[PDB]
Amino acid sequence: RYDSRTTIFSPEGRLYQVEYAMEAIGHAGTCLGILANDGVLLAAERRNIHKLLDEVFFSEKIYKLNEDMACSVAGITSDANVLTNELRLIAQRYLLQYQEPIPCEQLVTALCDIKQAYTQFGGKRPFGVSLLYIGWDKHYGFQLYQSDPSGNYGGWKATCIGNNSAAAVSMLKQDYKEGEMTLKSALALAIKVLNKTMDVSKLSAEKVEIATLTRENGKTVIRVLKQKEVEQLIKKHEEEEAKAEREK
Amino acid sequence: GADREVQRILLELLNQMDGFDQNVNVKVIMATNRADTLDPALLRPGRLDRKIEFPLPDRRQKRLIFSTIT
């Protein structure tokens, strides 16, 4: 059977297994890299919904590769964990060799390349994880990247994957902003898209996990948003929709 | 093909369960050994009206069964 093994093409040449990996990503928790300037953000609402969930790390979706590198997670949980460990390993290799921070595109290409190599050989299951990168480097500064199971990578200023990914990117292209669209407007737009995509009326703070990178002192900081800031962000978006109602 | 065919069997069974018209007084009862299995779509309350257990006869019940046959 063609679809049973990753090394067999369709008669049309398409690969069924990586397609199945993307339709898997279809189940992933909604998470996006928002459109921002002089800053960047990686909002990733947590699908984890249960009272006794401890969330002791307070972060299970956004993982900091270094103080200038953060990545998102959308895919198989264990595959995502081992992949994030491999990201940290590769960044460590580059830094230990050069004593310089790794560029965004180079690290993204390295991970996607090892992913493609894993998908290419037989007897091995493709990594069913797609992910996003927010970073700042010497060559290009602020960058957001998207990567798929096949090993394909690309640059997106604002993108979303996971649950209703198509709808999310659709309304992101709908009310698209550019230029003066700074980090705060990025938080507002991320709040908007998260409330629209999620079915929760008055989206709860614990259900969403947001992180952001900002160039402080030239050394940069990556802050994962705590409960309070998410709280007034969501409350401000709610009163903003109330304001939109007031126009009528 | 056997797997796809058994899945179509289950789907046709559910379609007939929801599809038997009103004013027809047919009752449908299913037996099972485990009941921890069985698709919740069939266990959907819109077509399951009661779930009755028949555990192994214990004391008293074994006595009643033995007396009844004997």
Partner: protein, 253 residues
């Protein structure tokens, strides 16, 4: 389903009820519509309603019924199905769960099907050849459109797509009122709360919840229902009593 019913009313009713515009426009009438959504989302109900209002005859044959155990039978059954379609003249043809044959086909091994594809291409010829498309239309339903293929979807073939998302708050209210219209309600019933306490309802499960409230009333020999009956009926029809812990967040996230 007001948005869905308006789209389908256009696509189906407008040609049969008012062919002249299409003759005035010169364009041939659209042939068929595909419906996709979660199971129980009134797709068959809506198709049946359209069949009723446009006064055209209703013929239903499920895709699971199409398979059969023998080669050369699905082709025959589809062709004669459209024979009944033509002999009944103004009519609509329903293929519930066409995805059962509109599915992935076995790509080699210890065996193969080769007949699901054959019934598919036979139906594809029948609707492609616009066989006597005078007051005859087709409609099919598919669960989780993703499993379906684009072979029937190719432009000159079936023309329109419809989505049947899970009912929202207002839709749940309407379904509750519609099905409980016959029920013997009691003062103090607040159906809005029950609708709120049922996020992500499948529409048919709303019929399930009202049937369950009636069953609770019946098992106590009451011919009347209360808010409490619907409230504990929600507890059984929530359908995640067997869910929320089959390890979903894990290994899938």
């Amino acid at each position: 389903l007001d948005k869905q019913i308006k789209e389908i009313k256009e696509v189906i009713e407008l040609p049969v009820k008012h062919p002249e515009l299409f003759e005035a426009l010169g364009i041939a009438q659209p042939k068929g519509v595909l419906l996709y959504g979660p199971p129980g989302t009134g797709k068959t109900l809506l198709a049946r309603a359209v069949a009723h209002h446009t006064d055209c005859t209703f013929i239903r044959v499920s895709g699971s019924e199409l398979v059969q155990k023998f080669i050369g039978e699905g082709a025959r059954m589809v062709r004669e199905l459209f024979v009944m379609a033509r002999e009944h003249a103004p009519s609509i043809i329903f293929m519930d769960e066409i995805d059962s044959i509109g599915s992935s086909r076995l790509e080699g091994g210890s065996g193969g099907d080769s007949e699901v594809q054959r019934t598919m291409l036979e139906l594809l010829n029948q609707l492609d050849g616009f066989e006597a498309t005078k007051n005859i239309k087709v409609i099919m339903a598919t669960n989780r459109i993703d499993i379906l293929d684009s072979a029937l979807l190719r432009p000159g073939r079936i023309d329109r797509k419809i989505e049947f998302p899970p009912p929202n708050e207002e839709a749940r209210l309407d379904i509750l009122k519609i099905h409980s219209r016959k029920m013997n309600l009691t003062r103090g019933i607040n159906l809005r709360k029950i609708a709120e306490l049922m996020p992500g309802a499948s529409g048919a499960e709303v019929k399930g919840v009202c049937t369950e409230a009636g069953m609770y009333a019946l098992r106590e020999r009451r011919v009347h229902v209360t808010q409490e009956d619907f409230e504990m009926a929600v507890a059984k029809v929530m359908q995640k009593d067997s869910e929320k812990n089959m390890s979903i967040k894990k290994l899938w996230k």
